[PDB]
């Protein structure tokens, strides 16, 4: 329900495969103004936002990828998954900050079980002591920088100041920190692969920190040429300034060019507030539940909300796998071998095995998977309808105007 | 540029399973496949280049990774597996010019939006498609699939999905090409598939939303999810779906045809719109808005040595992309380095595509369409670091390159 503030940082493979001397020693230190800071207000959660780099997210690719599940492993990127403890999220504030985003008019994407690659665990495995867990939880907001058109700067910048007001009206009691990663200055491709500005590094930090909004009219022309091509994904710190104060002081502002990037890195302390909001933090409590208000009332009814996602994903994810054709043929002939070597609990597997529609739709599998699990089973939609009105099928077929099946 | 009109219609598989069975014979089922007719012959006369298709996939191809307004901008679309294999069908082609044009003129009006080729089309898409156009080998026109994501809450508000079809409209009328382009809205109508609810329908409802939809479609605007689904079952909450292509049409419409039945769980139904132009001119103009549309990548063009990686470079590039992204599998980590040739005889790259990665033509992928970020994995899967690619980049050496600091 509080926010602490937010750090600007680079993300970098290089921050990775290194780490994990005259030219290191000085960023290393340029740093820990905030292992220091992270470790003090130790942040109960940290809203992460960052740029996956074609890894998990390629031939379907969103704009605003919130992270709903419970935990994220190391994306393995090419050069096996780098040993680290899965860090875990935050399912009820995700689904909260969902609520208030969609109903301010952002469209987003929701994500669950895919890799976090250096986009996220490089800078943080250097700001976070992850010996065998990490400090704090994570609500992954993954941007979609790299495969254009893309959600303009301003579209940046108000995203975040909706998604603060979001993480301002969570009703728990909890400090949360913001992390706007990626940048600066820098191009990784074309002819123009080595580009460096650092006048306007400088710049845009200064008035990054002190006069965002000047900032807001930025087309991706005057970023991409003042900073490189792959540096206008600074689009993300607009984006993360967004959620903290209109003023904050900055207690922190480190910064060196050495190998291929210009590695920065601004610490923000939230101030309070420019006044009251304008709306009262239980009335957009009120506003984002507005759309599913009452539905408790509609009955034999099971809405498939982020949160019944996240507790049917295991299930839900094995039995999406029916449409692999060489899957779905183990699930006939050896449906043990394939439970053993699942990840499926024992009563997902009992669910499974009894054929017991109607407890999956209580436990949070989502029909479409039945409807598939059903025709692998030469046994059609019908059955499963009758199953849930506890009939029998030419019982339930009485009650339809005729009696087709189909698969 | 030219939007002739929309049309409304229900993707039950049983519309699919219907059909692949032939049951245009039996008395059930032959009423409602000449209930299609209307809209089917419409489509044979007035044959739009691009239908641009509105609907909803159900957990196939979208599960893990879900997202609210889904553009398909790829080439070409087959028939997805939904436990049972693929449907009998050719696939249909896209259209990723229009595709792109769209995507610029949307994210101007501030839709976040989703991008996605290579993955297949379930029952959503074909079921009502496979009884609406003729296809023995050929399908009459391309499309523009619009995947929404309907299913996990919370979903776009009401006005959200009609504000989107009315940026939708401009910016296909925007299209600076003489194409006939129709306007598909999928699902609905009544009807709950899951729980002890299921079976639900309302056909009074059905009947009052479609009349309205048709003759006064903003009274539906401020409809919750919990209006729709306690009054057309859970499932056909989906007609939010209609309201965005009916976004995309004129003020007013000559509402052709509208055909109801239901057989069994769904209210299957179809309305067929005829569009009236705009009775006055917009208050953005066509040159305004292609303006506004390309605006942030305005004089891009003269940065050098700079290959922006556009919709037509991710569409130009996807075949070599995705065979670059499979290197994260590690199976297919170690065939690259120990039979490429025979990783390469497999796979659906041109000869070129397979030479220009033999080559570690660094440089030359970049020109081609590959993305940094592919290769960028190629050079670490097969013991080169980064250092040497940035220098090819440029054309100098490893040890020249690195002066710099
Ligand atoms: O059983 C049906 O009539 C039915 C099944 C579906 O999977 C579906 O998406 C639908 O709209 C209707
Ligand atoms: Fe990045
Ligand atoms: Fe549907």
Redesign the interface.
């Known amino acids: 329900a509080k926010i602490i503030g937010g750090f600007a940082v680079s993300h970098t493979?290089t921050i990775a495969f290194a780490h994990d001397d005259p030219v290191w020693a000085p960023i290393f230190q340029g740093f820990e103004p905030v292992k220091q800071w992270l470790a003090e207000q130790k942040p109960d959660v940290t809203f992460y936002v960052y740029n996956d780099?074609?890894?998990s997210?390629?031939?379907?690719?969103?704009?605003?990828?919130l992270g709903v599940g419970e935990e994220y492993s190391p994306?393995?990127?090419?050069?096996?998954q780098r040993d680290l403890p899965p860090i875990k999220g935050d399912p009820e504030l995700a689904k909260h900050i969902?609520?208030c985003l969609?109903?301010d008019?952002?469209?987003?994407?929701?994500?669950?079980?895919?890799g976090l690659d250096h986009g996220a665990f490089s800078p943080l495995s250097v700001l976070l002591p992850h010996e065998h867990g990490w400090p704090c939880r994570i609500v992954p907001l993954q941007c979609?920088v790299?495969?254009?058109?893309?959600?303009?700067a301003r579209?940046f910048w108000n995203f975040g100041r909706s998604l603060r007001r979001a993480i301002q009206s969570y009703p728990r009691d909890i400090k949360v920190a913001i992390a706007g990663t990626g940048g600066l200055s820098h191009?990784?491709?074309?002819?123009?692969?080595?580009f460096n500005n650092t006048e306007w590094d400088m710049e845009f930090m200064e008035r990054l920190a002190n006069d965002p909004e000047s900032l807001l009219g930025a087309?991706?022309?005057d970023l991409?040429?003042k900073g490189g091509?792959?540096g206008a994904e600074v689009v993300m710190w607009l984006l993360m300034r967004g959620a903290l104060s209109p003023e904050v002081k900055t207690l922190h502002q480190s910064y060196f060019?050495?190998?291929?990037t210009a590695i920065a890195t601004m610490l923000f302390e939230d101030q309070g507030d420019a006044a009251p909001p304008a709306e009262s933090d239980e009335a957009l409590r009120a506003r984002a539940k507005?759309?599913?208000?009452?539905?408790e009332?509609?009955?034999?009814?099971?809405?498939?909300?982020?949160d019944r996602?996240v507790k049917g994903f295991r299930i839900?994810?094995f039995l999406?796998r029916?449409?692999?054709?060489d899957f779905?043929k183990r699930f006939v002939e050896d449906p043990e071998g394939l439970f053993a070597e699942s990840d499926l609990t024992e009563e997902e597997k009992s669910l499974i095995r009894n054929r017991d529609w109607?407890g999956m739709?209580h436990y949070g599998v989502?029909?479409?998977?039945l409807?598939?699990?059903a025709?692998?089973l030469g046994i059609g939609?019908?059955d499963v309808?009758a199953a849930?009105?506890?009939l029998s099928v030419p019982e339930?077929q009485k009650?339809?105007?005729?009696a087709?099946t189909?698969?």
């Not at 997210?57 to 990828?65: D, G, I, L, M, Q």
């Not at 994306?75 to 096996?80: M, Q, R, T, Y």
């Not at 060019?257 to 291929?260: C, D, E, G, Q, W």
């Open positions: 493979p780099h074609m890894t997210f390629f031939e379907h690719y969103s704009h605003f990828a994306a393995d990127e090419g050069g096996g969902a609520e969609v109903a008019e952002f469209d987003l994407a929701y994500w669950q079980g895919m979609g790299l495969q254009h058109p893309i959600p303009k579209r191009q990784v491709h074309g002819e123009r692969a080595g087309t991706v022309t991409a040429k091509w792959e060019l050495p190998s291929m507005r759309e599913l208000a009452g539905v009332e509609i009955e034999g009814t099971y809405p498939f909300t982020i996602a839900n994810h999406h029916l449409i692999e054709p779905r109607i739709i989502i029909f479409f998977m409807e598939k699990m025709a692998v939609n019908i309808y849930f009105r506890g339930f009650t339809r105007n005729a087709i189909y698969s």
